[PDB]
Amino acid sequence: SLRQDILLNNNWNFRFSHQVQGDTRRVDLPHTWNAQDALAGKIDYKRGIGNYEKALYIRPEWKGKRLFLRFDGVNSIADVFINRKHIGEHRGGYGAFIFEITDLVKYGEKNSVLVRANNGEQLDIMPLVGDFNFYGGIYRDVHLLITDETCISPLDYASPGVYLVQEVVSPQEAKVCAKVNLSNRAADGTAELQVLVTDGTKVICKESRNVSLKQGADILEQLPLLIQKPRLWNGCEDPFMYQVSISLHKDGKQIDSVTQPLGLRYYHTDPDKGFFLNGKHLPLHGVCRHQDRAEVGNALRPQHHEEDVALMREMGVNAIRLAHYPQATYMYDLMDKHGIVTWAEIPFVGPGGYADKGFVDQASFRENGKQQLIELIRQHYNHPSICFWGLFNELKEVGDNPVEYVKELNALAKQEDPTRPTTSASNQDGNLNFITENIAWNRYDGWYGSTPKTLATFLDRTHKKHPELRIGISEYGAGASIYHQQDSLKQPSASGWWHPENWQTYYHMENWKIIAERPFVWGTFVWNMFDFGAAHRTEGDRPGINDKGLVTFDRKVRKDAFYFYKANWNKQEPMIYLAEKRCRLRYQPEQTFMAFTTAPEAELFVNGVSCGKQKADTYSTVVWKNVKLTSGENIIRVTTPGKKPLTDEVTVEYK
Amino acid sequence: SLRQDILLNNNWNFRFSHQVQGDTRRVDLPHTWNAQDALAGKIDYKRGIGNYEKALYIRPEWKGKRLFLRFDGVNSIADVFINRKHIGEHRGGYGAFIFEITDLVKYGEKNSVLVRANNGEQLDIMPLVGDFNFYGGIYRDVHLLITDETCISPLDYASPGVYLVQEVVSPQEAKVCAKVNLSNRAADGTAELQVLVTDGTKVICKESRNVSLKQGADILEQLPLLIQKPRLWNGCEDPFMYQVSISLHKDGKQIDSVTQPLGLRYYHTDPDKGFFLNGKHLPLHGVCRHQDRAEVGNALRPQHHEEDVALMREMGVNAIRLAHYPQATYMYDLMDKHGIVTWAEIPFVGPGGYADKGFVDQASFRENGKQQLIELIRQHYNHPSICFWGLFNELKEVGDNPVEYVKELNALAKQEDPTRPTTSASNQDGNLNFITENIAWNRYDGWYGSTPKTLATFLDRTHKKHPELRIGISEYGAGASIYHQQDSLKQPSASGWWHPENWQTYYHMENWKIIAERPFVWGTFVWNMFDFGAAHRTEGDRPGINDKGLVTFDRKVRKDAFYFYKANWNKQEPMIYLAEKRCRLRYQPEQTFMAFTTAPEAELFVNGVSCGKQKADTYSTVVWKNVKLTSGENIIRVTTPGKKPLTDEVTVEYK
């Protein structure tokens, strides 16, 4: 009677097609075959076909039901076979996809499921280029879905089949259109469709409709909902969601059901005053996050998403840009749950300072880009956290000019979802910046040359020249190795093998001050919350890594800048953090010590003797200058005021 | 006036000799060139020559002083050049070495220091084989040492030049012979040698001697010390050490000085009753630890040693086998500090289940083995934590038979240091087991076949047949991936790609029970405290890794077995830990839950409803059987008794 969702992750037989003999090894999903070679900095890591095969017992009692194989993600092309007969293809590495196998299997026996995954280079599947790894394989879950022959359809771009369209939302009332896809393979007849909105045990809406479904029908039903005096999803202040059950009934029996969240809110972006959520100004304190991790590549487990979100909330993050592609359903779920305003985007990624192009002007590429956009929007439609749809990152006009195609994507986004604005992330001047509703730039003033001050100049000049633009900062950052430490502050070469941590700290303190004074900037996103994989990189403390994270690739170590942001953004958790603790060897005659704290002041101790109190500045920073160390070991301690104080401590050597 | 010790770790120019053009890149020590390729499971990772060059300013005011380059470790051959002229060679990857450069430099200018490091295969430098990576390069610190022309010699196998020989130790008195190497390059004359033993500010011994030193003299002075009613170094109970200052004086001026610890104790090993420290029985709750780590290979920083020791102490470790080679001075220092009884060993490593040999019977190999043993003993002589010198690991008699050579090494160890017993780690029957004073075996009953019970049978039969042997277990362990989880307990294939965590947990619980009942076993050492690198491995959740750690390779995650040992070994820190939390998906009709706790009992809750209390067994384990889950999410909580209880919690899905 109930819909079943069966995980098919364990024990698949794997081999590369370049291994011609046919023998296989066991693997377990999520899986990528690029977790060792790409992460070792091998620039020509394996990009081609890997094959997964599993024997699936089709239970006799599933006869009469409908059966679907749903894939959460396979990078980048998947060809699926049942009993070695081809059933379909998916092109795109980040969107879910589904095939019905109801009439393709033999009931009561083992059937072969074969997936031939290809992450070889293509010129007709975005992303074509990018500063990250194109990890190959079935790197998200695989499900066997089992439903009634009359069901809420899972066949609409592999979405849940329900779109809760937020037409009008205010504190007085919300009008929602529940769009429901129905799929019928039963004999001609009827069913009753019910849409139930609840808050815990309390019933908020219950709307019903009798529907006549022809054999073979695949149709869209639209049920209007009205909620009086709604409780709004209000970011981290109150991430409230209703639950919606959508169900089908025949003769007073429920025969199918799906649940989706309903987090109601309204928003706008003001060119002069920034982002407003539910009628109130909201600074977007944002970071970016790639979907990979040390040692496992992009084969992330649920605890990895959970941990990433825990670290961001610890830091006081209230906004995120999930670059550079559609990410996991579970990850958008955590954004919903924790109230994090989210920018979600398609992988329409340009070259940046590197070679080749993000756009190749041929129908196959362009049609496939539209498919990946429709996938993004339909598959992730109901997540309240998503407040912006991103259409590109660092495209450029030279050669194949993407401006007209990006206009087509913008119009398609607005058609698919008029309830959210489009955005984009640019490193260019010119017409590419004037298509999406909001615009943002990737700025590295003070890292890739210049000084942080030119970010202030760029922001002010652009805002004055183009007062209609809603200006954001879609990336800003600096590299750091936790193993590169020096007593003095000196700007390093960005592309070199020396990325002292103190420069990243300096960079973020200076850039944050510029942002904090400019409320017309509707959101800013640190590049990046975590170090991440990019095989071609040859910089910092090891190849193959982009080290602009606030936290290391294995999520183990928070860099000093993490705590600068935590003090400023997470003000209600008491803390004190001494900066430059990893710089154990000191040689400067005049030592400077610096702490980040939520307290109004702090006290410094050197070798157990107080150096006195210093006040925190407006950026939660306390600084002591001309501190005198003695030759050899020195114990440095900082303490907040109060009867029960907080402390941080380190032993440094002075010579 | 003072001895100077200057770190030369930053900014060296590096290239491989296979890169013939001559251009270089910046590197910073500690460094290995095998941190990416070997750790990616590349079995033919780079083994050959890497070159490091640094310009060193020789200060005019160093003229008249003596200058030394001291290397803490270079794997495996180092050729050192000053202004591109060869000054010496070291063969051996784990012992320190030193060259005087006093008369080789130009004062008042930059001098070139060039180190040509080679980790290419050799048949004349142990280890010849082994289940670990032979990471190449200058992977420990480099120092410039500056002393008076008359000094406590740093030239005796690069040791501190002072051996505090523990002749007789008891609670009534300790007799120590302070052996001091003196090196003179001043004009013929005299100096006063002082040996000062202190406890904080309190003076315990002060012995002095006037010495006549010819020009060019390199001599040994021996000063007897007598300490009445000493405070003994007593393991974790009281890791007390005196400090010894050894100084040279001319005309009432101190001209040189070195400090060494003096941790006084006595011990013996009883064939029937196990290890006795300072006259009292002491169970050795041991683990093993390799000197590498995720992402950095063996280029460990001080915080890495510190963290490894923190994790071991957290687990209640009181003994360690620092396999399979001499490890860092700083690491033995931490063992001294924290009271951990230590087995230190030379890299005389045999093949185990793999090919080739640990012993090649040729003079060059054998003489070099003796050098590495003398290095080990002289360089690490004064560490109280070291209570055993290990001479080999898994050698075998077939082909080149090492028995007679190992007897030579045993006699050499006893000559170099009669104050500690020799030991060895065997996987063989026969004559190899009857050479060293203590013997131990590497046992994998229940992992590499058989069942844990045959360990009990082996231990009892050996002990009965050979009542004179002091029997230990130098390794025991099982593999586990934290990403391999299954609801049921089933023994996996050791060499396969599936290492469910629950089997490692089962293995350690069963083996520990066998050990705990057998006090004639003087020490046991878990293989291994941490997952570690072994490029040739193809098992568990990724290639290139030996996953028998209780803690993951990046030191981030403690496996369930870590907490079993912590509950049993660290009884005075209150804790409760629910096992199998990583096994999120449950399907067994009858669920079993298991907790490790220091409490006498604990209570289980399922979906907020108590299932009742259960008593902890003698191994700190609480178990609830036939627990009923409901379909879908279940919240599982366990709690200790008391007004302020401890808790552990997890959400599992049942289907």
Ligand SMILES: O=C(O)[C@H]1CNC[C@@H](O)[C@@H]1O
């Ligand atoms: O250079 C960087 O670190 C960033 C530049 N903008 C685009 C990002 O993908 C890239 O990673």
Ligand SMILES: O=C(O)[C@H]1CNC[C@@H](O)[C@@H]1O
């Ligand atoms: O097989 C194992 O895991 C161990 C067997 N004994 C020797 C170790 O070096 C090795 O790692």
